[PDB]
Every structure is written in structure tokens, then in C-alpha cells.
Amino acid sequence: SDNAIAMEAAHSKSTEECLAYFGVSETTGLTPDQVKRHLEKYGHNELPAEEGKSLWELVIEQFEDLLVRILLLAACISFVLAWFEEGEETITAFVEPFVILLILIANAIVGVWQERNAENAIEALKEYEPEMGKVYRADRKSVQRIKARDIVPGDIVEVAVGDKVPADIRILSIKSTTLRVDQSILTGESVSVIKHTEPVPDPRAVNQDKKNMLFSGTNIAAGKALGIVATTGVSTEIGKIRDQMAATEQDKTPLQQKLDEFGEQLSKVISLICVAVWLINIGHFNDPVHGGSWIRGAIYYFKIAVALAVAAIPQGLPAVITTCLALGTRRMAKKNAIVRSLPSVETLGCTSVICSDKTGTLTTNQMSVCKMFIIDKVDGDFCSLNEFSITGSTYAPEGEVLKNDKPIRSGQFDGLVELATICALCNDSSLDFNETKGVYEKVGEATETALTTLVEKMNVFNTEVRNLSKVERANACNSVIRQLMKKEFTLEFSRDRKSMSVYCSPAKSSRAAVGNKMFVKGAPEGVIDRCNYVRVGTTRVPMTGPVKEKILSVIKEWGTGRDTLRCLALATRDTPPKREEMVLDDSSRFMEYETDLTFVGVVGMLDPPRKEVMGSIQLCRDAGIRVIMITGDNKGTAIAICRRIGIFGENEEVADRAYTGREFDDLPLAEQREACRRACCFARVEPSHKSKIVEYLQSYDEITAMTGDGVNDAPALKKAEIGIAMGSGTAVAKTASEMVLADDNFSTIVAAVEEGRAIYNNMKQFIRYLISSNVGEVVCIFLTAALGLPEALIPVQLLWVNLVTDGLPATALGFNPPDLDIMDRPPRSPKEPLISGWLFFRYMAIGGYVGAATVGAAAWWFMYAEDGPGVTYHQLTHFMQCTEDHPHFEGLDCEIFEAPEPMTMALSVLVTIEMCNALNSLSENQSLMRMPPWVNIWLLGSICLSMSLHFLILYVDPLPMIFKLKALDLTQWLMVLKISLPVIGLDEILKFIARNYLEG
Ligand SMILES: C/C=C(/C)C(=O)O[C@H]1C(C)=C2[C@H]([C@@H]1OC(=O)CCCCCCC)[C@@](C)(OC(C)=O)C[C@H](OC(=O)CCC)[C@@]1(O)[C@H]2OC(=O)[C@@]1(C)O
Ligand SMILES: CCCCCCCCCCO[C@@H]1O[C@H](CO)[C@@H](O[C@H]2O[C@H](CO)[C@@H](O)[C@H](O)[C@H]2O)[C@H](O)[C@H]1O
Ligand SMILES: CCCCCCCCCCO[C@@H]1O[C@H](CO)[C@@H](O[C@H]2O[C@H](CO)[C@@H](O)[C@H](O)[C@H]2O)[C@H](O)[C@H]1O
Ligand code: NA
């Protein structure tokens, strides 16, 4: 982007001037060529980088280098203070600080990388949830949603309530009665501000004075408007205020709490073992009080404590957790489950209740009129209707009307003529043929578009359509009907009457003798009471009780039937008041205007459930996860749908498991709480009922997933453990949620729960693996110090094992395939400890065997080895007396006790045991005989890499001279194998005990 300013003083220009400056028609929008040129000139609508990645690594490197240099200077001060009179052994005090320096450098490197890895994992979340916007462009007549970064200056953009403003926008037209905007992120204003479209004359006016502009980042609090993009990217008012840092996420995840508890307890245990080593050596309490005995006897305990600290901490664990979470997040996003916060992953597996909206999530929101009836014959008490069916489930105008499964012509019935007239006039929506996809798409609400499609199918006025193109066919019959009745105005919907109407005057064309007419479309509950008459074809009879009961009976049948239809009543005021009589500024009077109606007919439209919903409901059943439907349908239809998708049984009694908002409010408080623990169906629900349901569900210590999309959903989404916003819904709901459904599908919720379970299981696996490895290392150190043996392992090798040798297999355990019963077990408790009970004893045995095996191989080299000396046990424990008391240990050089061969034996045994235990860590209970090792190929590859690196630091000459190791032969490797492989048998015995005797 070269020109970084775009249009200046857009608030000062008028709408005409702003459209003229970019040369765009407001009707069509930008042409593809205009979009290409503007994108090339002004660049994408986005801000560069994160916060400052080009100068961030240097900061952390220099900060940790300062933290290293200060410890170096402190240790130097200590060693220099140990020079005044302490001059006994200055040779041994020369090796310890070198190792400590290496430890500090290594821990600094990993502490930098793990932090950067976590930051990159957090930042990768944003790539999965790209901000979207709605534009009108010349290639399509309907509004199309695109990525906000693809919006360019001059674009015509549409914003509605709950949307996030994608660019700095000059308001062109306010479609709603008022436009209120929340500008708290910019001006810091509290209450929403009112916008207009008049120009603001002051060129240097403040943002609060720019009452005709929409600033990027702000949110539409109320209304709907159209505008033209003035500036994008950095030129945006919010792009100038790039200096803004919100508070961190905080709120420690339960896993982090358990890990920190482990850290504190491990500090205590390190202190306990450091004291226990002194407890073993009681003879040190018989030494003289003066001299240099206590000093040199305390230096040894200030070193073994450091070695034990290296052996005890799983240094590489946080990187493995971060990588597992990042890759699982990418997997979930590949499966349409867009996680907005890493903690939510852990929570996803604990989900005990899923509260889902019906329309759009459990169903496809692809509405279609499939049944309709009008009045046939009325004889006092007898009432007969003309029922019909309609084929075609999409919005395409393809299908026909069927009477008793036989096609008829809709124009024969005057009732159906009026039916179609009402459906065409009480309709703000239309159809647009997408020639690229080659399909018909909706322009407006699914309901009104289904009405439009029905009018196209019916063709009550008999119009030629076989010679029309796909574009001319979409809105042909509706245009025909519009040519006759001229819509004077529209009485908008209102809750108090549950209907809408249009005042229409007939055009002066052989139909002016009809007079003005009001056409009413609404819910039967609201419309039928206001009908005094009933249209019979072209005549009219008075509306009575029996007719009303017949209408209601058929509506009930369709609502509770196999199709679970939502019916719409259609009526018309034949003798409406005059335009001068009616006032339109207050909807409270509209119900009065829509009185003395004539009932014409009823349309039954279906919103089919998604074909995967039943199976996902079953999966939640097997997983012990309750599913509660929340719908706008009536209670009867709601229960019928619950039986259709499997929430309820086809024959079970549900008088206490299905409620309406009013019924739920009529119950006392204790009964409300008690009803939430059993209800699975809520119909006709107020926005506060979601929050109340979440609170009641929390009162039973349940982890609730609650779906939403609108602004009134935001509080509940905030209270719920897993707020789930729809991908097509508002931005306000998305910002208040833990997960977004890219496809708005309930099955995606189920898949997210399953994936969270699997990911937490694999995390448990590699956590227990690494920590049992650390247990084994600590046991090795303590067993060596207790028996007074030489150091079988040095802390450098321990760092290499914890960071490199074991880091690869743990990351690979992150990719373990999920168990076949992952969704046939109850939800995990969030307070579930990772290692306790039988697992404590199991991994304690494992770690004890690890330490015993390492130290025992180190001891085997000194004794029963051809390459090793003929040293016995009584002198190997007294090896420090070799240089002095030589006749007691006469034989070879004393330096043979500082040999690299026993350390190499111990390290090889540790590495082999850790590969074997990684193989054992593929499952918690299943033995290797049942689940083969070749199921997780990444584990095999990681073990190959670990062994290749081991052979590298053993044989490739420059490296074993650094690791203080010596290459081995076939006999020593065979000993390593013989003393390492039985760990598989040990864990196999423990698994057999857990399976065949510890299931309860
Ligand atoms: C790494 C080296 C070991 C020795 C260690 O200190 O870990 C202990 C300790 C801190 C716990 C223990 C370890 O305790 C022992 O192994 C007893 C040692 C006695 C030997 C002396 C006999 C001569 C864990 C390791 O035991 C083994 C047997 O599995 C399990 C678990 O750890 C976890 O669940 C990991 C959580 C991140 C913790 O009980 C944990 O403390 C609690 O806070 C938890 C919940 O952490
Ligand atoms: C003065 C001494 C300092 C200089 C060191 C000389 C270079 C050493 C060669 C090894 O390089 C290391 O290899 C590790 C693994 O191959 C990496 O660990 C990374 O990968 C592990 C597992 O893949 C994770 O557990 C670790 O956290 C993560 O640091 C680590 O980054 C990297 O440097
Ligand atoms: C695209 C446009 C075409 C679609 C229009 C659909 C046509 C239906 C319009 C009906 O108009 C009303 O019809 C009533 C009869 O059905 C008339 O009542 C007349 O007849 C009744 C009995 O038939 C009497 O009870 C009433 O008093 C007397 O007003 C009434 O005046 C008239 O306004
Ligand atoms: Na929430």
C-alpha cells in the first residue's frame, strides 16, 4: 500500500460526494476491476504484525542474559569470599561452577523457547477466526460476506445489530428507525451513541462529533445501516491508536494448578531427600567441631541438591503441552470447531450438558413450505378444508402443488390466488440466482424467502416461465403480483400481536373496484382471534367456533406430525381504515388496525434437522452428556421435534421434562432449580432464561456448553463454561464465547467434546511418562548417594534426557490415537488428579525400577565385566579410600572409579527404559499385546530419533568427549537390553492387575 490516507474528511463530505470520490454506484457496489485496483492501491484492511515480533527475541535474549550474568557474578562473589582462610581444596571447587553455568545457560534457552512457543500458539488462534464483513459488489445482487482484510476503500458495506464495524465507514443510509453504536473501545464513551447521515461541516472535528461515521473496531448496538468505506488498515482511527494493551487472560487452568502443586511438593521433597542423605551419615556428627570439616561437608550437600533438582524437574513438559494444544487446536479448527482460548480445550472434555438452539444448529435453517390449506366448505357446524402439498425442499422455484398426491393448477382456486397474493405482498425477501454455484440463494429471512419460492411454484396468475432465464425465473410471479396490488406501507411485526401486515391499494387496471386491502401474515395464535370472517374461494362467511376448531386441529396435526411444521396464518382486512386514520410511529396501535380480518389460509413450512443430529445425540447419551433443546416453536412442536431427533423417546412421558418460558417462570424457585436438572426442552424462552438455566446447572456442579448467536445471548455465553457462538452470527456473541462453530452444526459441538477428551487423555499420558522418568532419575540419585556409590549419571546427561531423549517421545505421545470407548465413558471431573491411588503405586514401582536398573548397571560394569575390573562389592562402596588406603583396595588404578564406561552403561539403560516406557505409555490399561506399538507411528519415529541421537553422542568422536561417555560393544548393549526390557513386563503386570482385578 503506497497511498496511506485514502479519502480525507469523509465526515465533511455528503453521501453523494463520498460515492463520487471513489466512482462507485451505491446500487451495485464496486466492480471486480474496481476492487482489484483499490486493493492494489490501498492494500489489505489489516494491521501489520502482532505487537513487535521484529524486536522481541532480542529483548528476551538480553533479559535472560542479564539474569545469567547476575547469577554468575553472585556465584563469583561466593567463590571469592571462600578464599580468605578457606584454602583446603580449591581444585574441586573449579568443576562445579562450570557445570552450574552450563545449567543456567540451558535453562535460559529453554525458558525463552517455551515462552515464544506459547505465544505463537496463542497467536495462531486468531488465524482460525478471521474477522468477516458484509459487502455489496457488482458481481452479485445479494449481500455477500467476505474477509474483513479484503474490504477496500469505496466498498459498500452493510452493518446490523451485533456486527463489528470492519473499516472506517461513511454512513450512507440508515435502514432502521435509529442507529446506535457502542464506541467504548475508541472514545471511551459509556452508552451507545446515535448516528445520522448528514454531513459534519468541521474538517477537524473530534471522533465524538463525527456522528455520520462508523469506526472500525466498534460495535452496532442497535439498528441496521449501509455505508461506504472511507479508509482501511493503519489509516483507520483505531489503527492510529495502535498503542493499546489489554490485560492478560489469567485464570489458571486446573491442569496448571495441579502442576504448580506438584512443583511445590517437589521442592519439599528435594529438601526432604537433602536432609535424608545427612540422616544416613550419622558418622558426620562425630567429626571435630573446628577446622574445615563442616564447610567441605556442606559443599557436597549443596551440589547433590542441585543434581537432584535437575533430575526432579520435567524441564521439557511445558513445550510438549503447548505443542499438543496448538496441534489439537489446528485439528479442531480443521473440523470446524474454532477454539478461542486454549483453556477451553481442557474444559471441552468435562462437558456434562450441551444446551443448543434448534434453528440453524439442530436444523439447517433451509425452510420450505411443504403443506398449505384453505377453506373449502362451511355448513354451520361442519367445516371442510382444501389441503395441499408442495414439492421441492430448496429455495429454487422448482416444484408443483399436489392435491391428494396428484398435481393441480393453483390458479383454479381463488383461495389459493389470495394465499399467494398475501405471501407475495407480506414479504420483504426475494431470490437471487448464483450463477457461479448455479443455485438459487435467499435475499432476506429464510421464512419470507420460502414464501417467495412458494409463490413462484404456485403461479396463480398463469405466467409463461419456460422461456425465462434462471435470473428472470427467480422473481417472476412475485413481480406479477406486485404489478397488481401497490403496497402503500407496512405495519411491522410486534410481539403483542405476533403478526405483520401491508396496506395495499389496487392499481387502476380493471381491479380498482376491489378497494384498498390490508394483507396480514402472522402466527395463528395471534391472527385467528382477530378474524371475524372466513374467505371461501371468492365469497365470505362469518367466522364461528367450529371453523376455528377445524383450522386449529389441522394446525395441531401439522405441528405434532412427522414433519413438525411451523404454521403461518394468512388473512386480510377487506375494509381497512383510511391512511389518514392510521398512525405509524407507535406499533401498539397496529393490532387495532389489523382487526375485523378475513381468514384466507395457512402455510406449513418445515426446517429439517441435520441428518447427523440423531447420531450425535446418541453419542452424547453414551458419553453421559445431557442435551437440552431451546427453540422458538410452541411446546407441542418442540416436544415433537425432540422426539424426532431423539432427545426424547417416542413414547416417554415428558410433562416434567419440557417447559415453556411462562411455565418455567410460574414454578417456584426450588422447583425451577429442580426442573433444570431434568428438563431437555425449553420453548418460547426469554433471553434471561439462558442465564438462569446456566446458573441452575452450575448449582449442580455441571460443566455447561451453551450456544448463542445474538447480542442477548452474550451474558449467558459469558456465564457458561463453554460459550459456543455461531459462525454466521453476530460478533458480540463470538467475543463472549469460548468456541465458534464455523458451520453452525451441533455435531461440531460433539466432535469438539470428543477431541477435547482425546487431547486431555494424551496429555495425561505424556505427563505421567515424563514425571515417572523424573521419579526414576531421583531414585537413581538417592540410591547412589545412599549406597555411597560413584555418580552413575551427571546432571548434563539428565538435561539431555529430559529435554531431548524424552522430549521427542512425549511429543509423539501427544499424537496417540483415541480409545474406542472415548465417547462411551462419563464426563471427566475437573478436579480429577493426574496420579493418585493405584497409579501412584504403579508409577512409583516404575520409577524405583528405573533408578535401581540404572545404578545396578553402573555397578555391574565395575564387577562382572570382562572390560571392567575384578572389583567386589565391599570395595566399590569404599572407593573414595582408594587413593589413601591402597592395601585395602590393591589391584588397579583408582581413576578407574571415574571411568566413563559405567556412566555410559547407566545412561544407555535409562534411555532404553524410557523408550520402553514410552511404548508402555500408549495406553493406561491396555497391554502392549492388545494395542500394538505400531499404531502411533510418530512414537516409532521419535524413538528412532532418540536412539540415533544416543548413538551420535556415544560414537561420533567429538560428542562423547563432551558428554563424558564411551562407546560400547555388543555385550554391553545386550546387558543394557537384558536389564531394560523387563520394565515392559513390570508395567504389563501392573496393567493386568488394573484390568482383571481393579475395575471396582
Ligand atoms: C520426581 C521424583 C519423585 C521422587 C518426587 O518427588 O515426586 C513425588 C511428589 C512431588 C508427588 C509423587 C511423588 O512421590 C513419590 O514418588 C514418593 C517418593 C518416596 C521415595 C523414598 C523411598 C526411599 C508422584 C510424582 O508420584 C509418582 C509415584 O507418580 C505423583 C503425583 O504427581 C502428579 O500427579 C504429577 C502432577 C503434575 C503427585 O502426588 C506428587 O505430589 C502431588 O502434588 C502430585 C499430585 O503431583
Ligand atoms: C551452552 C549450551 C547451549 C548451546 C546448545 C548447543 C546446541 C544443542 C543441540 C540441541 O539443540 C536443542 O535440541 C532440542 C531438541 O532437539 C531443542 O529442544 C526443544 O525440543 C524439545 C522436544 O522436541 C523440547 O522439549 C524442548 O523444550 C525444546 O527446547 C532445543 O531447543 C535445541 O536447542
Ligand atoms: C392480486 C389481487 C387479487 C387478490 C385479491 C383476492 C380477492 C379477494 C378480495 C375480497 O374482497 C372482499 O370480498 C368480500 C366477499 O368475499 C366482500 O364482501 C362482500 O360480500 C360478502 C359475502 O360474499 C358480504 O358478507 C359482505 O358484506 C360484502 O362486503 C368484500 O366487500 C370485498 O372487499
Ligand atoms: Na463463558
Tab-separated table of C-alpha atoms in Angstrom, residues 271-428:
chain	number	residue	atom	x	y	z
A	271	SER	CA	14.540	-30.668	50.842
A	272	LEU	CA	13.453	-33.947	52.468
A	273	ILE	CA	15.938	-36.025	50.463
A	274	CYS	CA	18.714	-33.483	51.040
A	275	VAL	CA	18.125	-33.966	54.772
A	276	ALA	CA	17.769	-37.758	54.417
A	277	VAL	CA	21.259	-38.014	52.910
A	278	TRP	CA	22.571	-36.362	56.080
A	279	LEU	CA	20.381	-38.714	58.130
A	280	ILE	CA	22.069	-41.755	56.566
A	281	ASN	CA	25.535	-40.468	57.545
A	282	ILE	CA	25.374	-40.355	61.336
A	283	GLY	CA	29.177	-40.564	61.470
A	284	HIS	CA	29.409	-36.954	60.291
A	285	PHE	CA	28.096	-35.985	63.744
A	286	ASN	CA	31.259	-37.488	65.292
A	287	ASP	CA	33.706	-35.233	63.416
A	288	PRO	CA	35.633	-32.432	65.157
A	289	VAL	CA	33.812	-29.131	65.557
A	290	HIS	CA	36.623	-26.843	64.371
A	291	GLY	CA	38.531	-26.858	61.099
A	292	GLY	CA	37.234	-27.346	57.572
A	293	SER	CA	35.110	-30.448	58.100
A	294	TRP	CA	31.704	-28.750	58.281
A	295	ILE	CA	32.412	-26.457	55.311
A	296	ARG	CA	33.579	-29.198	52.940
A	297	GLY	CA	30.831	-31.455	54.291
A	298	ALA	CA	28.249	-28.807	53.416
A	299	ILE	CA	29.605	-28.180	49.900
A	300	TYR	CA	28.735	-31.775	48.967
A	301	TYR	CA	25.109	-31.313	50.064
A	302	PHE	CA	24.850	-28.012	48.150
A	303	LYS	CA	25.795	-29.964	44.984
A	304	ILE	CA	23.762	-33.166	45.236
A	305	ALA	CA	20.750	-30.931	45.876
A	306	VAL	CA	21.365	-29.257	42.510
A	307	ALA	CA	21.805	-32.633	40.803
A	308	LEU	CA	18.520	-33.783	42.362
A	309	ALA	CA	16.838	-30.562	41.227
A	310	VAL	CA	17.905	-31.319	37.659
A	311	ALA	CA	16.717	-34.918	37.999
A	312	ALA	CA	13.358	-33.967	39.530
A	313	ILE	CA	12.056	-31.200	37.252
A	314	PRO	CA	10.467	-32.205	33.930
A	315	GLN	CA	12.000	-29.249	32.113
A	316	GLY	CA	10.616	-30.174	28.704
A	317	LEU	CA	6.992	-30.652	29.748
A	318	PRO	CA	5.594	-27.122	29.064
A	319	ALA	CA	6.826	-27.164	25.469
A	320	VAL	CA	5.145	-30.539	24.951
A	321	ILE	CA	1.864	-29.297	26.435
A	322	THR	CA	1.977	-26.171	24.256
A	323	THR	CA	2.697	-28.166	21.099
A	324	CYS	CA	-0.080	-30.651	21.882
A	325	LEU	CA	-2.582	-27.843	22.445
A	326	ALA	CA	-1.554	-25.950	19.303
A	327	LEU	CA	-1.763	-29.005	17.051
A	328	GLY	CA	-5.043	-30.158	18.591
A	329	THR	CA	-6.435	-26.654	18.117
A	330	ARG	CA	-5.450	-26.765	14.445
A	331	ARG	CA	-7.121	-30.187	14.164
A	332	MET	CA	-10.325	-28.927	15.793
A	333	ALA	CA	-10.402	-25.868	13.531
A	334	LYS	CA	-9.970	-28.236	10.592
A	335	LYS	CA	-13.119	-29.892	11.974
A	336	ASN	CA	-14.971	-26.510	12.102
A	337	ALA	CA	-14.577	-26.162	15.898
A	338	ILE	CA	-12.813	-22.815	16.300
A	339	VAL	CA	-11.417	-22.598	19.820
A	340	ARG	CA	-10.971	-19.038	21.060
A	341	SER	CA	-8.959	-19.850	24.191
A	342	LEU	CA	-6.554	-22.701	24.935
A	343	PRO	CA	-8.019	-23.453	28.428
A	344	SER	CA	-11.347	-24.233	26.767
A	345	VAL	CA	-9.740	-27.370	25.305
A	346	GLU	CA	-9.298	-28.810	28.805
A	347	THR	CA	-12.854	-27.744	29.646
A	348	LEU	CA	-14.317	-29.270	26.462
A	349	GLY	CA	-13.725	-32.792	27.766
A	350	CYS	CA	-15.542	-32.099	31.043
A	351	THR	CA	-18.762	-31.121	29.238
A	352	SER	CA	-21.739	-32.642	31.052
A	353	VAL	CA	-24.613	-30.663	29.471
A	354	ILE	CA	-24.995	-29.218	25.973
A	355	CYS	CA	-27.695	-26.551	25.612
A	356	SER	CA	-28.324	-25.966	21.903
A	357	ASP	CA	-30.669	-23.713	19.986
A	358	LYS	CA	-32.829	-25.522	17.449
A	359	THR	CA	-32.973	-23.348	14.340
A	360	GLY	CA	-29.686	-23.345	12.445
A	361	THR	CA	-27.814	-25.675	14.825
A	362	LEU	CA	-30.030	-28.746	15.178
A	363	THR	CA	-31.699	-27.866	11.854
A	364	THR	CA	-30.419	-26.476	8.569
A	365	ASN	CA	-32.491	-23.248	8.539
A	366	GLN	CA	-33.409	-24.149	4.941
A	367	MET	CA	-37.116	-23.504	5.309
A	368	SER	CA	-39.681	-24.605	2.760
A	369	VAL	CA	-43.470	-24.513	2.501
A	370	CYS	CA	-44.489	-28.156	2.080
A	371	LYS	CA	-48.188	-28.010	3.070
A	372	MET	CA	-50.977	-25.447	2.900
A	373	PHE	CA	-54.747	-25.343	3.200
A	374	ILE	CA	-57.649	-23.007	2.539
A	375	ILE	CA	-61.331	-23.140	3.426
A	376	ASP	CA	-63.401	-25.439	1.226
A	377	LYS	CA	-66.948	-25.744	2.594
A	378	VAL	CA	-68.663	-24.383	5.712
A	379	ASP	CA	-72.143	-25.536	6.802
A	380	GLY	CA	-72.870	-24.235	10.304
A	381	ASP	CA	-71.084	-26.870	12.371
A	382	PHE	CA	-69.385	-28.747	9.517
A	383	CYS	CA	-66.095	-27.402	8.191
A	384	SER	CA	-64.020	-28.868	5.358
A	385	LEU	CA	-60.675	-27.590	4.083
A	386	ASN	CA	-58.698	-27.891	0.847
A	387	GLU	CA	-55.355	-29.314	1.929
A	388	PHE	CA	-52.375	-29.332	-0.419
A	389	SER	CA	-48.769	-30.474	-0.566
A	390	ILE	CA	-45.822	-28.771	-2.267
A	391	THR	CA	-42.691	-30.487	-3.558
A	392	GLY	CA	-39.197	-29.040	-3.512
A	393	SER	CA	-37.216	-28.531	-0.306
A	394	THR	CA	-34.844	-25.793	-1.549
A	395	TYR	CA	-35.391	-22.130	-2.422
A	396	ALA	CA	-35.366	-22.925	-6.136
A	397	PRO	CA	-38.729	-22.258	-7.918
A	398	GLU	CA	-38.813	-25.923	-8.959
A	399	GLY	CA	-41.813	-27.950	-7.833
A	400	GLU	CA	-45.565	-28.224	-8.070
A	401	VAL	CA	-48.670	-28.204	-5.881
A	402	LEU	CA	-50.293	-31.592	-5.224
A	403	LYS	CA	-53.839	-32.353	-4.046
A	404	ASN	CA	-54.041	-35.943	-2.753
A	405	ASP	CA	-50.672	-36.739	-4.381
A	406	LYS	CA	-51.978	-35.507	-7.760
A	407	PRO	CA	-50.795	-32.292	-9.464
A	408	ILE	CA	-53.304	-29.468	-9.864
A	409	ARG	CA	-53.188	-25.870	-11.079
A	410	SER	CA	-53.137	-23.320	-8.259
A	411	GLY	CA	-54.909	-20.654	-10.317
A	412	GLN	CA	-58.147	-22.656	-10.285
A	413	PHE	CA	-58.753	-21.931	-6.585
A	414	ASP	CA	-59.475	-18.282	-5.774
A	415	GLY	CA	-58.466	-19.057	-2.203
A	416	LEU	CA	-55.002	-20.060	-3.404
A	417	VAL	CA	-54.852	-16.922	-5.554
A	418	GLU	CA	-55.374	-14.823	-2.423
A	419	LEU	CA	-52.978	-17.077	-0.490
A	420	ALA	CA	-50.207	-16.344	-2.997
A	421	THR	CA	-51.092	-12.645	-3.103
A	422	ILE	CA	-50.686	-12.384	0.674
A	423	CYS	CA	-47.439	-14.365	0.616
A	424	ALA	CA	-46.065	-12.119	-2.129
A	425	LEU	CA	-47.067	-8.765	-0.611
A	426	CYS	CA	-46.230	-9.552	3.049
A	427	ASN	CA	-42.676	-10.334	2.009
A	428	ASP	CA	-39.565	-8.160	2.155
